[PDB]
Amino acid sequence: IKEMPQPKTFGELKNLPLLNTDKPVQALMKIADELGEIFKFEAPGRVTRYLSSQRLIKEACDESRFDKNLSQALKFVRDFAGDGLFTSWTHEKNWKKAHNILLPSFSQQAMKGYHAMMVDIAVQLVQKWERLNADEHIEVPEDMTRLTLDTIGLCGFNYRFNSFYRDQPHPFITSMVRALDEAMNKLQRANPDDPAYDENKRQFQEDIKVMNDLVDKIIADRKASGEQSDDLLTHMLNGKDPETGEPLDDENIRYQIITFLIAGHETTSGLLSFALYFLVKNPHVLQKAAEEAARVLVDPVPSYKQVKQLKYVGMVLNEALRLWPTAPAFSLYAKEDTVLGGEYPLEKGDELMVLIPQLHRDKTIWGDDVEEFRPERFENPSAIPQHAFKPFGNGQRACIGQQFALHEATLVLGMMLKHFDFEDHTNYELDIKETLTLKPEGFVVKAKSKKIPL
Numbered sequence: 096i097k098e099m100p101q102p103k104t105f106g107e108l109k110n111l112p113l114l115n116t117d118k119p120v121q122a123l124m125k126i127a128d129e130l131g132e133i134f135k136f137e138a139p140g141r142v143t144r145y146l147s148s149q150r151l152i153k154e155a156c157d158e159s160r161f162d163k164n165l166s167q168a169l170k171f172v173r174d175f176a177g178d179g180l181f182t183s184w185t186h187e188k189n190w191k192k193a194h195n196i197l198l199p200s201f202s203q204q205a206m207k208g209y210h211a212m213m214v215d216i217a218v219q220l221v222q223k224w225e226r227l228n229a230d231e232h233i234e235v236p237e238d239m240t241r242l243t244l245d246t247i248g249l250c251g252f253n254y255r256f257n258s259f260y261r262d263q264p265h266p267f268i269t270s271m272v273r274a275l276d277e278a279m280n281k282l283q284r285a286n287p288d289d290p291a292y293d294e295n296k297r298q299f300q301e302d303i304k305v306m307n308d309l310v311d312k313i314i315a316d317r318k319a320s321g322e323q324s325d326d327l328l329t330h331m332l333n334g335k336d337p338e339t340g341e342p343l344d345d346e347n348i349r350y351q352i353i354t355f356l357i358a359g360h361e362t363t364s365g366l367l368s369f370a371l372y373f374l375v376k377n378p379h380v381l382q383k384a385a386e387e388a389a390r391v392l393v394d395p396v397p398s399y400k401q402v403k404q405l406k407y408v409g410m411v412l413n414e415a416l417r418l419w420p421t422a423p424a425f426s427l428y429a430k431e432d433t434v435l436g437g438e439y440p441l442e443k444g445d446e447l448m449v450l451i452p453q454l455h456r457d458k459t460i461w462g463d464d465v466e467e468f469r470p471e472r473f474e475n476p477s478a479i480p481q482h483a484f485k486p487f488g489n490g491q492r493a494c495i496g497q498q499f500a501l502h503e504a505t506l507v508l509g510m511m512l513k514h515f516d517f518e519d520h521t522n523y524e525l526d527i528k529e530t531l532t533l534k535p536e537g538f539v540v541k542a543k544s545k546k547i548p549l
């Protein structure tokens with residue numbers, strides 16, 4: 096039994112001003128490097144503890160001992176995501192209900208049904224790049240977000256955002272991004288009292304109304320037509336929870352749609368961006384990956400079966416998730432009084448934060464080379480210890496979208512590597528923008544077509 100280290104303090108603000116930065120996760124990563132596997136973090140009326148070691152995170156991941164907590168970031172996202180899967184407590188009736196209805200829609204099996212629609216968007220990405228002139232470059236995060244948003248639109252609700260036809264966002268996305276922006280900015284802030292932030296508050300209320308009206312219309316216009324298009328919206332309108340026997344009500348369905356639209360703008364787009372970054376910075380790896388893409392994707396249109404064969408492309412994506420897990424933290428609470436790691440006594444209710452990028456750098460798991468991009472670490476998936484690798488979180492509150500994310504990222508990265516050579520023509524310096532998620536800002540490449548017909 097021993098006392099926790101704590102980073103530097105600002106009198107009565109405690110540690111809060113440490114979050115007065117547009118890169119809080121990165122600042123928390125540098126604090127973990129200084130203080131080690133566990134530190135205390137206090138704000139006025141709040142105390143959490145950041146975990147960085149596999150030794151302590153394997154205990155936090157014990158579902159008999161700890162459950163999902165909504166962090167301050169999750170409570171602010173709930174103002175527009177409501178009791179959707181990502182922002183609901185495990186004990187809220189709508190969590191288990193929604194989880195049991197949607198779990199079949201997100202299985203490895205359901206991916207065979209989404210495949211055609213994903214390919215439709217991936218082919219739009221490849222044609223865009225095939226049609227660039229010699230002088231031009233690729234804005235990598237911008238194009239990946241166009242792809243992932245369009246993919247979740249079409250598979251989710253049979254809606255085309257047509258992001259490859261635009262350089263200005265949909266009225267929904269403007270509100271959605273501006274809501275999320277306001278939600279992360281609030282973390283550091285003084286209070287919800289300053290008249291200054293009323294304008295930020297006014298705007299936030301108009302954005303919640305805009306997202307709510309446009310998604311409530313979508314539900315309404317789909318119940319209008321009676322059409323049964325095999326999409327998440329159909330599954331949610333017809334689907335019945337086997338426990339309660341009930342379907343979701345229209346309000347919860349609107350919350351699920353908002354939740355899914357954010358995920359598929361903010362997470363998979365980041366994975367693909369990091370993955371391409373590590374590939375252009377590691378030529379030997381790009382070469383192994385492009386060899387597999389060219390051998391496997393022998394048809395102009397990739398099949399489900401062919402994407403499952405891209406083992407090494409899978410390993411690249413897992414290595415990108417290891418260094419830069421795009422949803423970098425999740426929050427837990429003690430269900431009862433308990434002792435963490437034989438050393439840190441917690442009371443019932445006490446909060447933990449899992450710093451996933453730090454977990455993924457634990458030299459006692461991964462060796463001394465933790466900063467190296469080596470997809471070969473993942474050649475043998477049973478060599479990875481339990482709870483050493485948690486990019487999709489933990490237990491029943493893990494990412495429902497995991498197989499959807501990996502199928503889309505494997506398909507698209509497969510096709511990119513099949514169709515183009517890539518040049519890091521600016522020698523890009525990694526600059527990680529923090530929203531809810533991580534993305535590489537300003538990441539630009541050139542592609543040189545291999546002139547393979549679609």
Ligand code: HEM
Pocket residue numbers: 163180181182194247354355358359362363366420421422424425426485486487488489491492493494495496497499500
């Ligand atoms: C590479 C992409 C993604 C990563 C790294 C990721 C990561 C995560 C993680 C770490 C959690 C746990 C959060 C927590 O404990 O607070 C989570 C939950 C969730 N994710 Fe994802 N995600 C990704 C893509 C997606 C996609 C594409 C969707 C939807 C189509 C999605 C939907 C969700 C939902 C609904 C939850 C809450 C599930 C529940 O608790 O019942 N995610 N994700």
Ligand SMILES: O=C(O)[C@H](Cc1ccccc1)NC(=O)[C@@H]1CCCN1C(=O)OCc1ccccc1
Pocket residue numbers: 114119120136137138141143166167168169282421422423424425448531532
């Ligand atoms: O939101 C929190 O409670 C903490 C930050 C905090 C604020 C006030 C007092 C004490 C701690 N959040 C976090 O540690 C991290 C860093 C910034 C975002 N974040 C987070 O966990 O956001 C929720 C989230 C959403 C989506 C994906 C991962 C994580």
Ligand SMILES: C[C@H](N)c1ccccc1
Pocket residue numbers: 181354355357358361362422494496531
């Ligand atoms: C990280 C998680 N997959 C997420 C879910 C919904 C909205 C934003 C993020």
